Amino acid sequence: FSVLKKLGWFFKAYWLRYTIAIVLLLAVNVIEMFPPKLLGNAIDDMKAGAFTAEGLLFYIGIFFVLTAAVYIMSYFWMHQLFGGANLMEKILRTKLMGHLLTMSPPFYEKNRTGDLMARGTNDLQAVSLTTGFGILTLVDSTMFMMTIFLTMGFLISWKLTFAAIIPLPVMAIAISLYGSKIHERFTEAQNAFGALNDRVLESVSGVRVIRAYVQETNDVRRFNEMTADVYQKNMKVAFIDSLFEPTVKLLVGASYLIGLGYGAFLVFRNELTLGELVSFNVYLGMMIWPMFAIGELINVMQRGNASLDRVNETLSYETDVTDPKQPADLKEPGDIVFSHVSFTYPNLQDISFTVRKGQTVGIAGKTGSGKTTIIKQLLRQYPPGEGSITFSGVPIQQIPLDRLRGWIGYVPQDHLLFSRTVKENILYAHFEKDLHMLPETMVGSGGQKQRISIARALMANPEILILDQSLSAVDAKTEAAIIKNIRENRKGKTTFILTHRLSAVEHADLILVMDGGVIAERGTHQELLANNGWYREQYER
């Protein structure tokens, strides 16, 4: 529970490899205390009279088998405990972007894409590192410390141990204090380097102006100043950084010297042997890692608590409507009737219009007036407003999402292509000629890509085809030919043409001119001629 379960669900279903790993790790922890004591015993047996070839052969055999045992147990348990990290990384990626897809864009695409892309790498790495490395540090800093402490407090002495151990708490606290400031002074270097990067980018984008007014030497003078500041920050950080190795060297040599001097003193009182001295020194040698492991543990367990709160907020707290409501549904979308719709973005005010099966309709208007809000709501990507959008008679919400999106064939004004080849963008229109032109090559000409979007939307063979300013890039003749061809092919199918040009969105079936926050009128092309002075055929030869 709390910080335990927050990651524990991962190996709650994987307890086998996250418990065998712990067991093998503790077995290695205990077994690793043998080689030093065996070496000390070999020394003491050499010193005494009793020593034969059998003891030597026995000692080399036991050392070999202990080596092989530790080598296999590590190669297996650490393999499991880091394959677990790999699997947790793979799980967190999958779950994060699965939430991404199974969502809508009303308030999420509002949220900065920078945060969303930074999560999926930074925080995934942070949490996976928690699970693996933080657990390893916990094991080697809560037990390995206590195990070695007691191995030297029961098998060597309870006097030499405390003496040779007193400096290590000081070492750990000094390491923590140094880390408390190196990070504080690392922000300075990183952000000054960022400022130099910003200035270099600003000087490299505006090269034409810089060289136009012959200021490049000033620029070089400005670039050198910032480089000097970056160097100065790096020095203010290296000053502290160079205090790490000296302090560990000092407080490990002090440990070794206390051990050796006090051990010789005790031996002079016949409380140890020499083999015990060698074994205790080997123990001191093997006790270095936990002192850094404790710091790594605390760092990771302090970082993860927030680096996982982030993922939790961008994975679970998100509660929006991306799914439909009641089984209620209309198998056929032929007719579309609006009723007092007041859709708003996360716009419309008392809008009402009608469409019918096999009706090529067009909509136009001015700028700043709801024109995308009409079809955008029909795509179910933003919260619904007042009124009703019924395909036959019932509210919009009951319409299923899968069937709805399958019916719509949409071409967006802000066109976007994903697949790297046009063939896959169409497997996802007058382009038979574009094939015999400059470009199935690759994606990522605006008009050509709009044509690709048109072909892709048409390939659905849909029943409600929405075109949103999809003909503003091509010529008037080209768009006229496109609309004529689609109307002839899709004679018995509905269309919702939308474009700034008031030529292909009036005479098809009807024009719903939108002005301000309400409708100007619901007439047709012929009625549009006799109406308020507006963008009529005067502005188009």
Added chain:
Amino acid sequence: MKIGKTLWRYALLYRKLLITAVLLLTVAVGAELTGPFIGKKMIDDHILGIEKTWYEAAEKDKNAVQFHGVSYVREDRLQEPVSKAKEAHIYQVGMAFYFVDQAVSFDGNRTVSDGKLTITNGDKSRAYAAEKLTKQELFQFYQPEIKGMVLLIALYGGLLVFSVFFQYGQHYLLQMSANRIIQKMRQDVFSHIQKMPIRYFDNLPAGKVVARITNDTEAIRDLYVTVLSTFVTSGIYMFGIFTALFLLDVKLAFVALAIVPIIWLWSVIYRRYASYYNQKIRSINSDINAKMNESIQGMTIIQAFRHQKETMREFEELNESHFYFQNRMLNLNSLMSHNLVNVIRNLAFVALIWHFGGASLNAAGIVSIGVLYAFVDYLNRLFQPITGIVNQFSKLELARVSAGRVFELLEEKNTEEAGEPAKERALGRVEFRDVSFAYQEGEEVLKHISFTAQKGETVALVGHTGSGKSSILNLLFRFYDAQKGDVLIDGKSIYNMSRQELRSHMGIVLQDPYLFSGTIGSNVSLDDERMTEEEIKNALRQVGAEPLLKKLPKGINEPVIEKGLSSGERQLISFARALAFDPAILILDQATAHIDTETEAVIQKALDVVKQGRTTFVIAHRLSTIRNADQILVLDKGEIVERGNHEELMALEGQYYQMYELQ
């Protein structure tokens, strides 16, 4: 060209710091390594000195130990040598220590039955009496050494503190060295970037160049830190430790020296496999990021199509391979790293035990546990940095390629050599003569563009896209060379002067007002450092309303803390800069495809202020706000289709009529 050669040539600079660091590190390593040698002496000569023969002597007082009877003195501590005198020993059996008051002819297996110590070793040299050393007696035989125990200890202590300083300094010094080299590097790079043809930045994005300036030089910084703080330090620590081992013992030193080939083969194969296993995760994570980014801004389209659930397919096709190679890297780590370190460490314990037992107690003697302890400490020190060594050796290649990139940038010879400004106002008499400019090869873009703009300003260049309107600006500032024809200013060939001189006559107000981050006053001045009060005057003359809102634009006012405000105010600042710099010739590469409402009105109010009293080139496409131009020129096909006044083209119809007919 070799990367290493230039890296060494760059390191030779700031060589004083490098030599100081190397020598400080060498002395610190020696001082530290001398510690385990002190421990060996302090064990063998003091703790294990009791084994040496003892002689009956109350003469050398203050160091002659007292048994229950007469007092004794060590062999080598015999200040008044008496030669044989009375031979005595203190032997060790199990835990007990036994005093033998008689000469012994052999050493070997020691057995005690009833106070009669027996040493035979298969020879039965003799049977000797013995007396248990009790507890106080054993301590009395240990007191003479206590002083030495303390003394050497202090020595150890001393050196430690000493080494600490000699360990700090060097590292710090190394840091400076590397950093300073990078600084040098960066400077040179940037200098060479200011000698680069505009083609360089035309055929390359800004991100690439900035990365080649800063991020690559940071990679080179890390390369220098890797080479110095890891390879040099590790090599020095290996040389010192091996020397100490060779001083201690030879054959065991030959065994220890037999590990360098082991590290060589370990590193070779680890790199050979880690190259695979790390390239094939860096590339795959790049693919992962590309897929995730290409499928997030299309949340409105991916949702409304048949791919909200098909992305998973090809992704996981990539992701399973990513995780598979992650696990392969984990396997390679498992068969190496700390694991092989511990395997070798246990093999070293085995080597120590085998050698000592088989060569010392097979002959029943010549055992030095001080040498054992020193070897143990030395090999513990040795086996620390192997993992870092192999890791850095594997990592070196990316730094190698980044350094190669920066060297290629620093090395190419196609650069522009100039820097000389002018000393007069040209009066804007720019002339052209059958310029035939070709961009890549053979595909000419300008066809004998010949004309002569007089001091009368506003020679507007309004024409067709893909014609050469921007080529005119590029050749005017010599951003490119025409490769034919000629261009002149007051009869002076453009291709026989200096670029800085040429651009010192002409300014520009580009369609995209560059608002360099900082203060507005410096922005308009472009940090000139040669105008003090004219900037505010030439700004207020046209944008006098803007300061009325908040503070003073020259007075470090900061509406430009986001790389700016209103686009009109953005183009107005550009105009103010162009006026303050006050060139003779003036080019307006104005491209307003989407005019921002009526804000352009004041913009026109600004243009008339600046265009006057100059030789202005207005590369516009409105053909309505420039109806007072002294010479309209229309450009299509790369050749001057038509030229004339604002009215002389209306009479002749032509391309100008065609465009102005789309009024």
